[PDB]
Design a binder for this molecule. Structure first.
Ligand code: HEM
Ligand SMILES: CC1(C)[C@H]2CC(=O)[C@]1(C)C[C@H]2O
Length: 408
């Protein structure tokens, strides 16, 4: 049963589209394919859906890029749909606008900057190799449960100095954040609230122990960056450490599944990566253009007209980032991975002050994964007649990716 809200007076009927971000029409064919259905040659740049409490959707890459870059007009005070969930959302610095945002991003950058991430390469590689060698000789694996849900999680827990046995409970919380249970805005609001509270509960004792700590882990490093000459306050720290976990454990996991499904169906592309190691390294950004995973929102600051559309203060706009990288107006043949594409511009990591803090880590993890995968399993395919199961939400998800190959 579908829950609809009535459009407000300022929303004209010709802009209304029945789009359910948590259950996209056509989702069985793929998350990216389902979002692409929304982006027809003449659809308005901004459309409004009565689902998920009622909100706008930006349908073209230029709007998505622009909105991310304009925090003074499009605020981060709410970045989730439905509104109830977005209002319950308590993660730092992602809930913040400049200038409050900036010192917390600085703190994060102390741990996640490119020079720090480069130091992590060999530890990431070791984890990759270890997992891959578990099944490489076997000639088949279920890629989701045997690799994509394992690799980025072990990497991040190691980096964060946390026990790997916590993976399960943290993945469960993460999934209730990005796809909160419920068929109703109020239900989803509650689901998100309980998950966000679970993160705070888990993270509180760690914060208390690592304040002033001498650990070399990511949490200790970031926790102990001063904020305006003072220790980071408790409320902020809870939201900050929870966000680290949320970003580290869900994002790359999901991305890898979508990426691998495409690769398993395009051996010519795989062969190119295998024969030119530099095309692989240089081609990773094209993969990020092609396999966006995040669809989140911004809050309209003031009554305004934007791309010919009347917007009211408090309106939410969902930003399906796939609709930038896959916008046929930004990239010719957007659905094809072209490792040589010169222009790969995309919003897979968003734009503006919130542009992904973990993007260097995400690129390194993917780069190392492909290098170590192709070294040991150079050719592979999706099992015959296999059907991946897809989910849409704030972060896309996919499971059931049975791969097959001939042991080398
Ligand atoms: C496939 C991988 C990833 C994708 C597609 C991705 C996507 C994004 C997006 C779209 C945002 C902006 C959200 C918004 O403000 O509306 C973001 C922010 C952020 N991400 Fe990532 N992310 C990925 C990996 C990671 C990883 C591995 C981490 C490690 C902790 C991470 C940490 C963060 C943090 C801390 C922010 C907030 C930055 C700020 O508010 O200034 N992300 N990410
Ligand atoms: C949308 C995000 C991917 C981004 C902000 C969130 O809450 C995430 C789910 C984790 C972080 O990286």
């Amino acid at each position: 049963q579908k829950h609809r809200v009535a459009p407000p007076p300022h929303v004209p009927g010709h802009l209304i589209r029945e789009i359910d971000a948590y259950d996209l029409d056509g989702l069985e064919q793929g998350f990216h394919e389902a979002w692409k259905r929304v982006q027809q040659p003449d659809t308005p740049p901004l459309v409004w859906t009565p689902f998920t409490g009622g909100h706008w959707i930006a349908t073209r890459g230029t709007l998505i890029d622009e909105i991310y870059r304009s925090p003074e007009r499009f605020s981060s005070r709410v970045i989730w749909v439905p509104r109830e969930a977005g209002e319950a959302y308590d993660m730092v610095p992602t809930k913040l606008d400049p200038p409050e945002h900036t010192p917390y991003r600085k703190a994060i950058d102390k741990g996640l900057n490119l020079a720090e991430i480069r130091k992590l390469e060999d530890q990431i590689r070791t984890i990759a190799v270890e997992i891959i060698e578990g099944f490489a000789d076997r000639g088949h694996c279920e890629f989701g449960s045997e690799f994509s849900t394992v690799f980025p999680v072990r990497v991040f827990l190691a980096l964060a100095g946390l026990p790997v046995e916590d993976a399960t409970k943290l993945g469960l919380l993460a999934n209730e954040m990005t796809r909160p249970s419920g068929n109703t805005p109020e239900e989803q609001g509650r689901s998100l609230e309980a998950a966000n509270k679970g993160f705070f509960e888990y993270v509180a004792p760690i914060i208390a122990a690592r304040r002033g700590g001498s650990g070399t882990d990511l949490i200790t490093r970031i926790l102990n960056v001063e904020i305006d000459g003072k220790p980071m306050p408790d409320d902020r720290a809870l939201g900050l450490v929870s966000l680290l976990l949320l970003g580290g454990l869900n994002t790359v996991v999901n991305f890898l599944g979508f990426m691998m499904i495409y690769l398993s169906r395009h051996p010519e592309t795989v062969a190119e990566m295998r024969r030119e190691p530099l095309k692989l390294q240089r081609g990773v950004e094209e993969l990020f253009r092609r396999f966006a995973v995040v669809s989140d929102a911004r809050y309209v600051v003031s009554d305004m007209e934007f791309h010919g559309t009347m917007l009211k203060e408090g309106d939410l706009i969902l930003l399906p980032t796939a609709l930038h990288g896959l916008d046929d107006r930004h990239h010719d043949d957007p659905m094809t991975v072209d490792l040589s594409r010169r222009d790969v511009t995309h919003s897979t990591f968003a734009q503006g002050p919130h542009r992904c803090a973990g993007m260097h880590l995400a690129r390194l993890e993917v780069t190392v994964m492909l290098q170590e995968w192709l070294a040991r399993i150079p050719e592979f395919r999706l099992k015959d007649r296999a059907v991946p199961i897809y989910h849409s939400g704030i972060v896309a998800a996919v499971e059931n990716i049975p791969l097959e190959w001939e042991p080398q």
